[PDB]
Amino acid sequence: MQKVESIIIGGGPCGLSAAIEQKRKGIDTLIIEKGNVVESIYNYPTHQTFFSSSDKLSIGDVPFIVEESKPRRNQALVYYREVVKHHQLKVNAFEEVLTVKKMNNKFTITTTKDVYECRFLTIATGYYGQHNTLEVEGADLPKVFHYFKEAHPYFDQDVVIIGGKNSAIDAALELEKAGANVTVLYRGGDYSPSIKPWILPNFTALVNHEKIDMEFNANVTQITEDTVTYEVNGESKTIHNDYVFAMIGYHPDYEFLKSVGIQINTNEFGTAPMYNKETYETNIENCYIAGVIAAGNDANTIFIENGKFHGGIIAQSMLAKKQ
Amino acid sequence: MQKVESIIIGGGPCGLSAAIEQKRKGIDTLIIEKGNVVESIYNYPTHQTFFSSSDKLSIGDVPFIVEESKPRRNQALVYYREVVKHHQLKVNAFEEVLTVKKMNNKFTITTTKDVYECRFLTIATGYYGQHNTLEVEGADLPKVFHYFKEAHPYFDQDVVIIGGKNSAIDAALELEKAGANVTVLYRGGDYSPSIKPWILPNFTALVNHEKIDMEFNANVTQITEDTVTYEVNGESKTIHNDYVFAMIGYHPDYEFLKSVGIQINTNEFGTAPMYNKETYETNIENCYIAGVIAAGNDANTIFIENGKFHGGIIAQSMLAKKQ
Amino acid sequence: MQKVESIIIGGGPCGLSAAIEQKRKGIDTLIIEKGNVVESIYNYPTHQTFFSSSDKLSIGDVPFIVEESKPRRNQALVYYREVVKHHQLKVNAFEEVLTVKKMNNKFTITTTKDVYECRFLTIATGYYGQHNTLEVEGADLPKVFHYFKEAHPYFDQDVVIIGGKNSAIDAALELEKAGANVTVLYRGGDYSPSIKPWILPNFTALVNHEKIDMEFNANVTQITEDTVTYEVNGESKTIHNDYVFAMIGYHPDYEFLKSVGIQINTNEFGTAPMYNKETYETNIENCYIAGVIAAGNDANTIFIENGKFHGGIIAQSMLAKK
Amino acid sequence: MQKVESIIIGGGPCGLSAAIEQKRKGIDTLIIEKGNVVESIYNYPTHQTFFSSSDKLSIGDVPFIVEESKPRRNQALVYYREVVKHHQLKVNAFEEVLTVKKMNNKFTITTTKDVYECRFLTIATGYYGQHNTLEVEGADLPKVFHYFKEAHPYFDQDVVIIGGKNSAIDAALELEKAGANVTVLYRGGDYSPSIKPWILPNFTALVNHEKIDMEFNANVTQITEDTVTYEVNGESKTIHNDYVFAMIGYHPDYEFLKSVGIQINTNEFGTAPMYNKETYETNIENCYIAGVIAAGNDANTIFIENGKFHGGIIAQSMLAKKQ
Numbered sequence A, B, D: 001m002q003k004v005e006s007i008i009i010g011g012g013p014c015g016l017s018a019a020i021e022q023k024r025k026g027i028d029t030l031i032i033e034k035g036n037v038v039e040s041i042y043n044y045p046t047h048q049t050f051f052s053s054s055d056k057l058s059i060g061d062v063p064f065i066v067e068e069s070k071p072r073r074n075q076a077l078v079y080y081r082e083v084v085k086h087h088q089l090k091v092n093a094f095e096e097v098l099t100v101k102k103m104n105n106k107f108t109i110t111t112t113k114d115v116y117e118c119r120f121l122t123i124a125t126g127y128y129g130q131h132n133t134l135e136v137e138g139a140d141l142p143k144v145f146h147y148f149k150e151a152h153p154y155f156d157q158d159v160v161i162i163g164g165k166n167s168a169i170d171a172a173l174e175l176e177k178a179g180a181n182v183t184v185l186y187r188g189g190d191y192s193p194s195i196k197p198w199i200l201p202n203f204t205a206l207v208n209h210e211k212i213d214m215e216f217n218a219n220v221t222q223i224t225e226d227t228v229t230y231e232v233n234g235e236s237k238t239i240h241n242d243y244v245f246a247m248i249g250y251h252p253d254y255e256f257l258k259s260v261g262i263q264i265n266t267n268e269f270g271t272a273p274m275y276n277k278e279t280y281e282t283n284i285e286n287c288y289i290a291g292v293i294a295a296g297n298d299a300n301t302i303f304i305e306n307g308k309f310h311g312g313i314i315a316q317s318m319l320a321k322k323q
Numbered sequence C: 001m002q003k004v005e006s007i008i009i010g011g012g013p014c015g016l017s018a019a020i021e022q023k024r025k026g027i028d029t030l031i032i033e034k035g036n037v038v039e040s041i042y043n044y045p046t047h048q049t050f051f052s053s054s055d056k057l058s059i060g061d062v063p064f065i066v067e068e069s070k071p072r073r074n075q076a077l078v079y080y081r082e083v084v085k086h087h088q089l090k091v092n093a094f095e096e097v098l099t100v101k102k103m104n105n106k107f108t109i110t111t112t113k114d115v116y117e118c119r120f121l122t123i124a125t126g127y128y129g130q131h132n133t134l135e136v137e138g139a140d141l142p143k144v145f146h147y148f149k150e151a152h153p154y155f156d157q158d159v160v161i162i163g164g165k166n167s168a169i170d171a172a173l174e175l176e177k178a179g180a181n182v183t184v185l186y187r188g189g190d191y192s193p194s195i196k197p198w199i200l201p202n203f204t205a206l207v208n209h210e211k212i213d214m215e216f217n218a219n220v221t222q223i224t225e226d227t228v229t230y231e232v233n234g235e236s237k238t239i240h241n242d243y244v245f246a247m248i249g250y251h252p253d254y255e256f257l258k259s260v261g262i263q264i265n266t267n268e269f270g271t272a273p274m275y276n277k278e279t280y281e282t283n284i285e286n287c288y289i290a291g292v293i294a295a296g297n298d299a300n301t302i303f304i305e306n307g308k309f310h311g312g313i314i315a316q317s318m319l320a321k322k
């Protein structure tokens, strides 16, 4: 088999940042990525614009420079590839880590391709692989998506969006521009404070001109092949519907996390993996986490801007264990 | 059942142009589309730029205006949606025509959703849905694609492209820019004259700088999961390979075309469906074809520029039969 | 000379709009344009993005379509040309109108290139060409601009913006992106309500991060070649400064409008030419106005979305006079 | 009055690169730029796309990364600003060097604002500031430009282009798309070999479809207020004309170069300042040149790709002369 000093599961922005900082402290590292690098960003909608400025998304001391104020999807894809190029990062792409076991101060990593042995382990798997479950009658129909890519095919179609945060509002804007009849169904009372303040004005003007239907205090009770039923303050309504976008968020792969021996503790910000807030080391010795995997479900506490700093913290703790 | 005067199978540019012109002659028409309108363009590579100027792609008195010299994908998607909006065209989306049978002087169309009765039938299904068969050992592996979408996931991967016309060179440029190691194997002797003269210089420069491996007179003999074997002037060569893009063209759904009763004619123009060159009517009475489906093999005779004129021709012939 | 039935002064969106609807009613027209068509849009900042949708700017039987939600400066340029191409409009470019005198029931039009005599006249000259005067010492210095174009050359320069409307806010964001040290000096108390609610948060965040200096209740008192002096509730402050953008708004060429015999107003909500509202005809018979030149009395503003609809109202009034 | 070790006249790509490389060897440098940094690039047409790839334009180890194949004008502006930011370069902008004289072991530099004294001088002023002389009757009229910016104001105007290289061909394409009536007058016999091979097809197709007038072997003899008279192999023609674009090239400020005491040596392939090819030092001790100002004799073309390496070579020569 292969023996490397450190292995990092996940080649996202926070995973890449973890390998760069470990390499800067003289630790030979290998990233194993289920797809290719920044697969999460690659899976954004094709039109997506980041909400951060491009400099705040930069890692490794490679400047992220874009004429525009905020960068789009593909611009980040080009950047992070150059980040891997510049730091000469070892990246085993299209390989899925399936099992991690610790044996006498060593890890045994079993993937889809090879078997690995390492001293240090860093899990930066994010949460985008596991979408929250809808739990309404009809939620498993093929007309229900939890991911948004493009809006053109839904031209002149009756579309319902479940959710109220940035994914829902973003998709509604793109779906309206493509000729779809968009009905957003949010359970809250007012707009979520997490919708960024420069996007909501363009959405509110559309609901004022009666181009997009917005409904508050709305919970979806039934989804059929061609209808959607939702209740507002008790009153049930049923409308024709062709597709449903369940933008209800994501959550980490807790099944994988417990199978290595990591505990879920639940605390201030919620159900999160147990880790030392000063070193990001988990309850399992020599196993660290990095990225949005440390926040839990809450998709507003940790993002790319602050998750990229975990690598520098992990690098210090690993170099310390070298007595 | 539903009874409409005319039905058009396919909502591509030539299908839309056919429906516009029939409506101009007072013919009630219905488009049945397997996906949504201009699904072909929607399935282009994401970065794709058209070879034609935007005026040449315009149909049914709706001007196609783009600040750019040549229009990109999405821009055509936005345009053709506005064409459907402007001309009030009936488009039953996500419905696939499965069976056509002639009874008396009327057609019985059976789809995935409904059954229809019409007098005139127009088949404009194109050829993009059916890729040419490779016919080499290993062609059925999941690592072999006949369609190109994006190049980022193949970053730092060993990629081989089979083909030599515009699809191959476009994919090679995008794959080279995304950091892949590209090797183009062409069975021809020199560059195909059908490569647009403003794209090829960008390709040959990278070949001269040895950034893209180009092989002429090369035929692929075997594809494994991680090698590709090809012969050059008799010499067999084997290189490591991660993915294969078989850009070997497409062909019409001849099975569906024979299942309605339309003849395939072995002509010295590239084997094409049987139709009257002056009206585009097939051997079946009141059944027409439109678009690139009339060129059969050669994907270089008919494109959007001249295929959009089929609609005007069919409308005259149908108006001659009156009603 | 030349004699045309109707002549229109100005080739902006509303000048083009009035020509189309008069032609639809069978009125032969000629557009006399100081520059070329939509000179105003051409003289936007190079980066500029409209705040309207792409179809609220569309005129006369030509759809305006863009893959983006809001079109940019260059896309409108390409569009409004194609509108002229589609409608076969007669436009005389680089020809400024200098004198209009009403003799008989006709007009004699004196331009920089020929003499014209016409029955119907439309003055659609807008306001973007005549900038409000600054009224501070040093306003005539070469370091003082009333137009923003690009931000690059002011990289690592000390810049000051006078005003607080969308013009001042847009130019500040662009100059910050280009690395300039920007100080916005506004005479008002809070943020102008006319700032687009999707633009303000970007300017707000930069100010709080101390990337852009924002001083409310600020009045500029002096401009030297290397400083700018401004008072904030009486307290004077003087800072090093390399360039100045007086984004203090604009006003129509009223001097020209009176010189033909059209009265002004200055009533409560502003100041406007006299027009019938129902025909847009002025006190001068057979003399019409169109565009943002008509704003001033109404409590609402005039953009391209509304002002473009004036050409239709004018066409009926001219068709009524036959 | 002000004393710095080294001064660089010109803040273009090659000037900026020279200051970075000198700073890498511990030399205190000051750039004096008539406008701001890369003013030459700033004065391109607003649409201009580079013919080099973005990697080849990179300097002072700051990567120039752009999603697209080739970088456009503004994108280079954004990049080079970040280069000055990243290296912290002293850039006295809007200052024009008027006089340079050698005294003792010092130079006395007189600008528009201050006076400077330095040991090492590097002149990297380029050529884009001083246009070649037209030498036909009417060349000083306001309707005659030697610089192209945008094409919209010339919509539906009669425009004549003098020249035959990329500047002329680029301007012809941009002016045609804006509705101008373009006549190109080239004193050559065939298309210039310096036109890029991926642009000539686009220009070729417009000439063959009679949308642009192309006239070889044409020399302009007179420019009037609204006509232009030109002879082709002696035969004179006169056409109506509203504006004239004299794309007849540019040349360095040789007068400024001779006024400091550097010899300009005429030869074949053009005329260049005299300098040692291994240090780029002129006949004046401690006076160097950098950038495209160095081309002329050596029979080689200079662009940003190769001009950016002068700084590293000059830095060695300045370091060899010690302190």
Ligand SMILES: Cc1cc2nc3c(=O)[nH]c(=O)nc-3n(C[C@H](O)[C@H](O)[C@H](O)COP(=O)(O)OP(=O)(O)OC[C@H]3O[C@@H](n4cnc5c(N)ncnc54)[C@H](O)[C@@H]3O)c2cc1C
Pocket: A009, A010, A011, A012, A013, A014, A015, A016, A032, A033, A034, A035, A036, A037, A038, A039, A040, A041, A044, A045, A048, A049, A050, A051, A052, A095, A096, A097, A098, A124, A125, A126, A127, A128, A129, A290, A291, A292, A293, A302, A303, A304, A305, A307
């Ligand atoms: C539309 C959209 C826009 C956004 N915009 C912004 C923005 O502007 N700014 C910002 O800061 N954040 C933004 N985000 C959030 C951003 O995507 C996350 O903060 C970020 O992706 C988290 O990075 P990560 O490295 O922690 O994990 P991820 O980015 O999710 O990547 C983890 C990687 O691990 C891989 N992986 C998963 N399971 C396995 C396994 N078993 N074996 C091997 N590999 C595995 C995945 O394929 C993936 O490549 C946006 C998100 C979305 C959806």
Ligand SMILES: Cc1cc2nc3c(=O)[nH]c(=O)nc-3n(C[C@H](O)[C@H](O)[C@H](O)COP(=O)(O)OP(=O)(O)OC[C@H]3O[C@@H](n4cnc5c(N)ncnc54)[C@H](O)[C@@H]3O)c2cc1C
Pocket: B009, B010, B011, B012, B013, B014, B015, B016, B032, B033, B034, B035, B036, B037, B038, B039, B040, B041, B044, B045, B048, B049, B050, B051, B052, B095, B096, B097, B098, B124, B125, B126, B127, B128, B129, B256, B290, B291, B292, B293, B302, B303, B304, B305, B307
């Ligand atoms: C990358 C790329 C770039 C191209 N660039 C250009 C260019 O610049 N200029 C140009 O002129 N051409 C270009 N083409 C070619 C262009 O795609 C075709 O010429 C054009 O799409 C033909 O239109 P059509 O209406 O005849 O058929 P299509 O556009 O192929 O559409 C036929 C439609 O019928 C539908 N359909 C198929 N079977 C059924 C069924 N059984 N029931 C119902 N619906 C069905 C399909 O889903 C499809 O939507 C390009 C092609 C590619 C792949």
Ligand SMILES: Cc1cc2nc3c(=O)[nH]c(=O)nc-3n(C[C@H](O)[C@H](O)[C@H](O)COP(=O)(O)OP(=O)(O)OC[C@H]3O[C@@H](n4cnc5c(N)ncnc54)[C@H](O)[C@@H]3O)c2cc1C
Pocket: C009, C010, C011, C012, C013, C014, C015, C016, C032, C033, C034, C035, C036, C037, C038, C039, C040, C041, C044, C045, C048, C049, C050, C051, C052, C095, C096, C097, C098, C124, C125, C126, C127, C128, C129, C167, C253, C256, C290, C291, C292, C293, C302, C303, C304, C305, C307
């Ligand atoms: C940065 C910026 C952004 C804007 N964004 C928007 C937006 O998103 N939406 C919107 O609706 N509006 C917008 N506007 C305002 C818009 O420019 C005006 O509403 C519009 O120009 C009015 O059109 P008009 O035809 O009435 O006048 P103009 O567009 O100004 O055109 C009048 C024409 O007359 C010519 N002319 C002037 N004087 C004379 C003379 N004496 N003789 C001959 N010709 C003359 C001028 O050169 C000009 O070509 C914006 C303005 C600015 C500065």
Ligand SMILES: Cc1cc2nc3c(=O)[nH]c(=O)nc-3n(C[C@H](O)[C@H](O)[C@H](O)COP(=O)(O)OP(=O)(O)OC[C@H]3O[C@@H](n4cnc5c(N)ncnc54)[C@H](O)[C@@H]3O)c2cc1C
Pocket: D009, D010, D011, D012, D013, D014, D015, D016, D032, D033, D034, D035, D036, D037, D038, D039, D040, D041, D044, D045, D048, D049, D050, D051, D052, D095, D096, D097, D098, D124, D125, D126, D127, D128, D129, D167, D290, D291, D292, D293, D302, D303, D304, D305, D307
């Ligand atoms: C339309 C166009 C497209 C081009 N595309 C490309 C391309 O794709 N790739 C490529 O490699 N090249 C390209 N070029 C060429 C490129 O512009 C030059 O090769 C490059 O700018 C040379 O840089 P430089 O530093 O040598 O001098 P420059 O950058 O040209 O000029 C040096 C600076 O000195 C300043 N200066 C002048 N006189 C004084 C003075 N007295 N005091 C102080 N400062 C002064 C000037 O303002 C200028 O900014 C293109 C040129 C044009 C016109």
Ligand SMILES: NC(=O)c1ccc[n+]([C@@H]2O[C@H](COP(=O)([O-])OP(=O)(O)OC[C@H]3O[C@@H](n4cnc5c(N)ncnc54)[C@H](OP(=O)(O)O)[C@@H]3O)[C@@H](O)[C@H]2O)c1
Pocket: A048, A049, A050, A051, A132, A133, A134, A162, A163, A164, A165, A166, A167, A168, A170, A188, A192, A196, A247, A248, A249, A250, A297, A298, A299, A300, A303
């Ligand atoms: N602008 C952008 O660039 C952009 C766009 C999309 C996403 N993102 C990023 O994407 C990440 C998260 O992706 P996301 O937006 O899909 O997730 P998210 O931010 O967690 O959104 C969750 C949404 O789903 C609702 N929801 C949660 N559980 C639900 C349940 N069981 N039933 C019904 N509704 C439920 C939430 O309700 P509550 O509001 O009551 O919690 C909220 O509306 C964040 O980091 C976010 O910033 C950014």
Ligand SMILES: NC(=O)c1ccc[n+]([C@@H]2O[C@H](COP(=O)([O-])OP(=O)(O)OC[C@H]3O[C@@H](n4cnc5c(N)ncnc54)[C@H](OP(=O)(O)O)[C@@H]3O)[C@@H](O)[C@H]2O)c1
Pocket: B048, B049, B050, B051, B132, B133, B134, B135, B162, B163, B164, B165, B166, B167, B168, B170, B187, B188, B192, B247, B248, B249, B250, B299, B300, B303
């Ligand atoms: N620039 C763009 O926007 C763009 C990009 C892609 C496609 N297109 C258009 O799409 C259409 C189809 O183009 P295409 O290139 O996909 O198809 P195509 O025109 O049929 O070209 C097929 C290519 O594959 C080769 N080939 C065919 N069968 C093969 C086999 N069995 N084994 C090996 N090689 C084989 C062909 O060889 P031969 O040369 O000997 O025939 C040719 O090089 C055309 O209209 C094209 O212009 C446009």
